[PDB]
Amino acid sequence: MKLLVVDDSSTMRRIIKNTLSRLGYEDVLEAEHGVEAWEKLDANADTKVLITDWNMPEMNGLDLVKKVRSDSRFKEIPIIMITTEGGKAEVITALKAGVNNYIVKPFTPQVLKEKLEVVLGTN
Ligand SMILES: [Mg+2]
């Protein structure tokens, strides 16, 4: 279960990675921006799950998601967007792009554990 986690906040990456670890997911690769995330997916097509934010320089998460879904290798990759964009207009926008599960920031460590366990369970 190779996961890639993309967020331009170092503290957010910390919390997500720790939470995944608590759930038994240890094979976690990170990226700070969309460009870097895309390079990593393209070069590590064995990646099983993409977890991404939305707002970030160097390609935003919506564009990343569209690009992933347009690639023949990643038609079925689960995509989890974790973002402060809580408005339903944004939710709809992201689901249409190919996001499968949408988790709205901010959360406590425990709430993130609960919401990720819903999607991924334990490993
Ligand atoms: Mg961000």
Ligand SMILES: [Mg+2]
């Ligand atoms: Mg937050």
